[PDB]
Design a protein around this ligand. Structure first.
Ligand code: WHL
Length: 132
């Protein structure tokens, strides 16, 4: 047969995510990791699959793996915050989303209003949690 390159399996998991096959996509990213475990995006992409699967702990651990490879990652800080938000770790979530925002400015990355909106939503969810 043929065995793909790590890059080729990342491409395949990307297509599987867009096809809404999230456990399959996540396994594809694991196969990419087997070939090259030093590529941050494989872990962040797999964390998005885990989030869609409502597996917050597994997504969180992949965000940590990505952050050990790229400490400047907007995407890893953003999805770390999103994992924490889903787990109701509100203050940690907001700080990581704010760090994502600052990094994106430093890097001149345009996500429209997505990060400010994500913060507003996070702070409102936190506020509602405090007011009971
Ligand atoms: C390039 C790429 O992956 N684009 C893309 C478009 C639409 C969506 N939508 C959903 O997954 C629901 C994902 C990725």
């Amino acid at each position: 047969g043929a065995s793909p390159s790590a890059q080729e399996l990342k491409e395949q998991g990307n297509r599987l995510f867009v096809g809404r096959k999230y456990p399959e996509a996540a396994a594809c990213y694991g196969r990419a990791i087997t070939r090259n475990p030093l590529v941050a995006v494989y872990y962040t992409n797999r964390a998005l699959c885990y989030l869609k699967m409502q597996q917050h702990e597994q997504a969180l651990a992949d965000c940590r793996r990505a952050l050990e490879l790229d400490g400047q990652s907007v995407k890893a800080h953003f999805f770390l915050g999103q994992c924490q938000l889903e787990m109701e770790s509100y203050d940690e979530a907001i700080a990581n989303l704010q760090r994502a925002y600052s990094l994106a400015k430093e890097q001149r990355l345009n996500f429209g209003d997505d990060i400010p909106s994500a913060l507003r939503i996070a702070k409102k969810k936190r506020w509602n949690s405090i007011e009971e």
